[PDB]
Amino acid sequence: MKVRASVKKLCRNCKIIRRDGIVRVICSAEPRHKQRQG
Amino acid sequence: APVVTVMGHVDHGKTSLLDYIRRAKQHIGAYHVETERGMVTFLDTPGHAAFTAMRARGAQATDIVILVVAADDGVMPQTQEAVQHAKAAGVPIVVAVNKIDKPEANPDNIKNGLAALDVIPEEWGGDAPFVPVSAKLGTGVDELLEAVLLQAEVLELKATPSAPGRGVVVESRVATVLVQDGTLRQGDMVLVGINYGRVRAMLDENGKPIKEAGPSIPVEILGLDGTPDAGDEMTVVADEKKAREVALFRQGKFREVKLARAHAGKLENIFENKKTLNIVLKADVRGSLEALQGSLSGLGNDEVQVRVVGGGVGGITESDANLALASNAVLFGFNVRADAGARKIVEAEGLDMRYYNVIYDIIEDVKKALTGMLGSDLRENILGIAEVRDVFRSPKFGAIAGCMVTEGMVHRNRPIRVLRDDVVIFEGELESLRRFKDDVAEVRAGMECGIGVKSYNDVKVGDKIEVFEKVE
Amino acid sequence: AIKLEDKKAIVAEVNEAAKAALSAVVADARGVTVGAMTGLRKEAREAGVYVKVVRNTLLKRAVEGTQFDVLNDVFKGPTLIAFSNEHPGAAARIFREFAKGQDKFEIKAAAFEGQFL
Amino acid sequence: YIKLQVKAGQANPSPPVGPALGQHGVNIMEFCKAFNAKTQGQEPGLPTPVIITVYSDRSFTFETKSTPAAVLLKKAAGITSGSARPNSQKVGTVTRAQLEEIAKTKQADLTAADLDAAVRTIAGSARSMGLNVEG
RNA sequence: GGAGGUUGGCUUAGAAGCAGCCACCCUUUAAAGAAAGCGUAAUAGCUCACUAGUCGAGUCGGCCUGCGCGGAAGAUGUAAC
RNA sequence: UGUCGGCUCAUCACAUCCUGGGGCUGAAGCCGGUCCCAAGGGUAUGGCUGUUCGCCAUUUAAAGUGGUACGCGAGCUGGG
Numbered sequence: 001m002k003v004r005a006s007v008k009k010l011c012r013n014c015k016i017i018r019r020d021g022i023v024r025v026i027c028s029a030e031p032r033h034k035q036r037q038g
Numbered sequence: 039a040p041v042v043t044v045m046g047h048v049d050h051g052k053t054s055l056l057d058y059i060r061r062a063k064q065h066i067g068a069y070h071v072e073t074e075r076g077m078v079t080f081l082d083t084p085g086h087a088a089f090t091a092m093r094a095r096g097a098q099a100t101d102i103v104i105l106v107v108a109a110d111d112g113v114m115p116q117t118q119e120a121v122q123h124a125k126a127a128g129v130p131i132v133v134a135v136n137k138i139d140k141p142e143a144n145p146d147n148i149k150n151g152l153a154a155l156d157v158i159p160e161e162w163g164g165d166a167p168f169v170p171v172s173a174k175l176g177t178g179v180d181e182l183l184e185a186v187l188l189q190a191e192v193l194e195l196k197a198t199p200s201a202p203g204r205g206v207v208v209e210s211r212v213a214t215v216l217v218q219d220g221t222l223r224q225g226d227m228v229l230v231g232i233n234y235g236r237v238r239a240m241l242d243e244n245g246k247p248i249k250e251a252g253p254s255i256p257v258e259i260l261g262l263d264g265t266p267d268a269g270d271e272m273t274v275v276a277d278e279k280k281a282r283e284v285a286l287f288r289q290g291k292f293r294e295v296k297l298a299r300a301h302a303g304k305l306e307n308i309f310e311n312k313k314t315l316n317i318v319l320k321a322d323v324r325g326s327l328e329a330l331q332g333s334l335s336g337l338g339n340d341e342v343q344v345r346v347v348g349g350g351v352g353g354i355t356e357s358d359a360n361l362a363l364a365s366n367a368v369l370f371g372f373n374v375r376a377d378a379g380a381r382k383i384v385e386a387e388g389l390d391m392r393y394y395n396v397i398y399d400i401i402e403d404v405k406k407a408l409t410g411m412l413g414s415d416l417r418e419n420i421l422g423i424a425e426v427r428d429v430f431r432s433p434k435f436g437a438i439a440g441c442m443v444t445e446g447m448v449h450r451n452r453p454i455r456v457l458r459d460d461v462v463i464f465e466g467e468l469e470s471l472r473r474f475k476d477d478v479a480e481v482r483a484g485m486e487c488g489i490g491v492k493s494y495n496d497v498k499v500g501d502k503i504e505v506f507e508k509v510e
Numbered sequence: 511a512i513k514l515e516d517k518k519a520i521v522a523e524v525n526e527a528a529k530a531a532l533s534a535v536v537a538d539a540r541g542v543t544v545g546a547m548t549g550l551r552k553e554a555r556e557a558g559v560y561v562k563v564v565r566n567t568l569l570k571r572a573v574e575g576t577q578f579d580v581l582n583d584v585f586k587g588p589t590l591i592a593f594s595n596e597h598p599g600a601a602a603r604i605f606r607e608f609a610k611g612q613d614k615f616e617i618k619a620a621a622f623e624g625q626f627l
Numbered sequence: 628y629i630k631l632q633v634k635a636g637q638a639n640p641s642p643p644v645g646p647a648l649g650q651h652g653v654n655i656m657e658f659c660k661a662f663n664a665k666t667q668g669q670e671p672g673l674p675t676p677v678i679i680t681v682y683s684d685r686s687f688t689f690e691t692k693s694t695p696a697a698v699l700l701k702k703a704a705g706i707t708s709g710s711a712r713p714n715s716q717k718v719g720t721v722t723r724a725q726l727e728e729i730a731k732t733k734q735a736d737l738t739a740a741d742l743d744a745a746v747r748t749i750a751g752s753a754r755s756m757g758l759n760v761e762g
Numbered sequence: 763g764g765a766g767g768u769u770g771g772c773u774u775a776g777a778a779g780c781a782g783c784c785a786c787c788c789u790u791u792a793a794a795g796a797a798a799g800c801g802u803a804a805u806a807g808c809u810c811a812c813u814a815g816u817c818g819a820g821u822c823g824g825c826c827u828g829c830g831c832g833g834a835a836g837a838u839g840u841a842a843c
Numbered sequence: 844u845g846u847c848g849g850c851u852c853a854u855c856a857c858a859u860c861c862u863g864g865g866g867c868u869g870a871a872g873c874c875g876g877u878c879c880c881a882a883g884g885g886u887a888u889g890g891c892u893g894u895u896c897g898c899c900a901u902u903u904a905a906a907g908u909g910g911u912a913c914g915c916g917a918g919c920u921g922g923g
């Protein structure tokens with residue numbers, strides 16, 4: 001997982017969700033596109 | 039009565055099958071079994087590496103060879119390397135799927151996987167037999183023993199019993215021989231390679247003392263002055279002075295032939311001395327092997343045919359070097375270096391061995407060799423080697439590695455390769471080298487230093503670093 | 511995507527052909543490759559049979575000139591209008607053997623002089 | 628099954644035909660004569676495609692589709708290399724009389740309604756080479 | 763379903779939609795890029811763009827603006843109403 | 844309001860050196876790289892130099908980074 005301040009989609013399958021008051025990116029295509037914070 | 043060699047991939051069943059077959063019907067190096075269809079013998083040590091070394095000495099100590107594969111985990115790279123080693127020598131290959139005693143019991147991928155190697159089975163095209171056997175279970179001894187002879191269908195005459203002594207050496211402990219032609223009544227004077235003696239001890243495989251040696255049967259002789267090599271040849275003489283004169287003539291002729299080989303067999307002397315130039319390829323990855331094989335499969339038609347006789351992935355093991363020597367071939371290492379034993383065989387014999395980094399370079403060189411107009415001594419040189427002994431990487435800039443510099447001078451004005459297991463991993467240039475934390479810029483031979491390479495930090499304990507200059 | 515101006519443009523082309531066409535059939539095309547459809551369109555083009563694919567909701571709009579109005583009950587699922595321009599019938603023999611070999615489409619229904627068949 | 632592009636009558640065991648000996652093992656010397664059975668037809672050299680349908684063991688089939696419409700335009704227009712940059716660096720020239728035959732020798736494998744359309748297929752292929760088409 | 767001329771031309775040991783450069787047409791079509799991505803040494807192989815069905819009423823994005831959310835780690839003890 | 848270093852004795856922060864739990868990897872295995880959570884307990888001996896530091900020699904699971912009048916002379920020393 002990649003922790004930044006500027007989280008955003010990297011491809012079509014990425015998905016912006018908000019979980020316990022934190023913005024996250026979950027991607028079914030590539031497990032490298034996971035992101036936190038931001 | 040052929041002479042069989044067992045041959046296959048590691049942990050597939052060779053020793054198991056050999057021991058079983060011997061047990062059904064004290065290790066010296068050879069053994070023999072009598073069956074109603076005819077006596078058949080085997081050599082103790084299996085594997086191509088031992089079979090081709092003696093062949094590299096004109097021995098031709100083989101008639102038939104058998105591959106053992108497994109129903110599970112079938113053709114593996116050393117299996118196809120063995121089939122290469124058997125075709126290059128040239129003997130019919132009789133196959134046997136061993137591990138049919140398992141739940142994974144499908145000799146269906148084996149057949150159509152091994153078929154794409156010119157070992158096509160009978161139901162496919164009719165070229166080489168296939169047989170399921172199982173040393174653990176036992177079901178398959180009969181079919182294999184019948185097929186070993188049914189596939190021995192050359193005339194198979196000669197081996198005229200009453201004949202002068204003529205055999206080949208096997209295990210030079212004291213020694214053994216597996217005679218081809220003649221009889222070896224004990225007490226007779228003998229020339230065994232560059233060596234002389236008389237037969238006092240004539241032990242058998244089981245150790246029962248005898249005095250008569252069969253036509254194609256093994257026997258361990260003891261009484262000779264010492265130990266010859268492992269592939270030399272033995273005959274009968276009568277005069278000790280004759281034996282010594284022949285020995286010295288052999289010394290001189292061998293010292294001549296080594297130079298003649300190291301002269302004419304170079305790549306530089308291709309056109310002068312058809313002739314079907316043989317190469318022996320070794321590449322770093324399978325793609326750069328297949329591509330360059332397909333490139334050198336066709337080069338020139340009416341003058342010289344270039345056919346690759348080897349080809350594997352990894353460093354230049356000494357089995358590869360022995361194969362190249364025996365087939366009078368030219369080594370080729372694309373991004374792979376030689377081991378120690380390969381260096382030993384290379385230094386003793388001739389057998390041109392040249393390294394490369396660009397696919398195009400080998401094609402260019404072979405073109406100029408086939409036209410006989412190639413230049414000599416091109417494409418860089420080795421001006422220093424270092425061995426990595428410790429890798430420490432501080433969290434400010436972590437790339438430094440301790441190195442013991444061996445036989446050469448490593449500098450900063452020359453690019454480098456880093457290589458593990460005699461296979462290169464990276465080719466760049468230096469970033470830092472510093473002794474006692476002080477940035478000296480020239481490291482001597484036999485010294486020790488700390489090397490760090492630019493834009494690559496992955497060196498490990500046990501690597502090597504070569505430094506080279508594109509010299510022209 | 512398509513536009514409203516083109517939507518009423520494509521119904522005229524079906525309506526223009528259907529005005530003078532004599533024998534028409536309806537068939538599906540799911541599962542058959544576009545490669546295997548080049549052969550069929552080659553056969554029809556040699557025999558003067560006009561084959562086309564239109565939207566179901568546009569076929570009902572297009573077929574209004576009292577030509578094949580007895581077909582508006584089977585415009586469900588994919589469609590392929592195959593109107594016969596010469597030798598009425600014609601584009602039924604082509605569909606007769608093509609259905610057998612290719613294993614696709616039930617050839618829905620057919621219309622001839624107001625016969626649902 | 629397997630397909631490739633070999634010359635007009637040689638088809639010898641060579642890097643033109645490398646993986647036919649690995650696809651199913653296959654006696655490739657058999658396929659060499661079989662390809663040579665239809666011989667040159669246009670003298671050896673002109674590349675011709677194949678569709679080798681492989682069955683249990685090494686059953687063959689053999690069609691020889693056509694001769695590709697790139698060597699044909701180079702032949703009828705002189706030079707044997709097309710442009711390294713179309714638009715400007717024109718290389719050849721043809722006429723609507725040559726385009727008639729080069730399509731008439733591929734009326735199989737063009738699936739074009741009438742032959743007037745089959746020409747506009749070829750002229751589109753010319754405009755990528757560097758040739759320029761005219762009367 | 764996602765095709766045919768066609769491994770588009772050049773280059774290249776090999777460049778086949780997918781190393782790099784130039785183009786970027788045509789055919790059968792409901793639709794299909796001289797190809798957006800993954801893969802191969804080159805192929806092969808798997809998706810996407812696009813279109814035909816099915817489902818029946820809302821749906822998609824941008825602009826202005828009020829209040830909030832992350833970005834936000836320190837040393838004796840909550841300890842920045 | 845006695846100013847460097849050594850000795851004795853400590854106390855806190857976490858921006859974690861080891862041990863503990865995880866995500867990604869150009870992660871096959873044995874090793875690693877990087878980021879996240881975690882302050883419970885541990886966290887060298889010597890040669891040179893007045894030295895803190897540093898460089899060497901041999902170890903260790905590791906030989907953390909800082910604040911405390913650059914902690915500590917009505918606790919010692921007195922080499923600078």
Ligand SMILES: Nc1nc2c(ncn2[C@@H]2O[C@H](COP(=O)(O)OP(=O)(O)O)[C@@H](O)[C@H]2O)c(=O)[nH]1
Pocket residue numbers: 047048049050051052053054055136137138139140172173174175
């Ligand atoms: N299940 C099974 N195991 C076998 C069979 N044959 C051999 N093995 C096992 O596989 C291993 C083969 O090793 P071996 O051939 O002796 O070593 P190698 O000479 O280097 O090939 C042995 O440990 C045997 O126990 C078989 O038919 N079935």
Ligand SMILES: [Mg+2]
Pocket residue numbers: 003004005037833
């Ligand atoms: Mg942040």
Ligand SMILES: [Mg+2]
Pocket residue numbers: 020
């Ligand atoms: Mg939670």
Ligand SMILES: [Mg+2]
Pocket residue numbers: none
């Ligand atoms: Mg295993």
Ligand SMILES: [Mg+2]
Pocket residue numbers: none
């Ligand atoms: Mg707002």
Ligand SMILES: [Mg+2]
Pocket residue numbers: none
């Ligand atoms: Mg805020």
Ligand SMILES: [Mg+2]
Pocket residue numbers: none
């Ligand atoms: Mg606190």
Ligand SMILES: [Mg+2]
Pocket residue numbers: 838855
């Ligand atoms: Mg505190």
Ligand SMILES: [Mg+2]
Pocket residue numbers: none
């Ligand atoms: Mg933390």
Ligand SMILES: [Mg+2]
Pocket residue numbers: 859860
């Ligand atoms: Mg830590």
Ligand SMILES: [Mg+2]
Pocket residue numbers: none
């Ligand atoms: Mg930890």
Ligand SMILES: [Mg+2]
Pocket residue numbers: none
């Ligand atoms: Mg961990």
Ligand SMILES: [Mg+2]
Pocket residue numbers: none
């Ligand atoms: Mg980790």
Ligand SMILES: [Mg+2]
Pocket residue numbers: 857882
């Ligand atoms: Mg703490």
Ligand SMILES: [Mg+2]
Pocket residue numbers: 882
């Ligand atoms: Mg604590």
Ligand SMILES: [Mg+2]
Pocket residue numbers: none
């Ligand atoms: Mg602590």
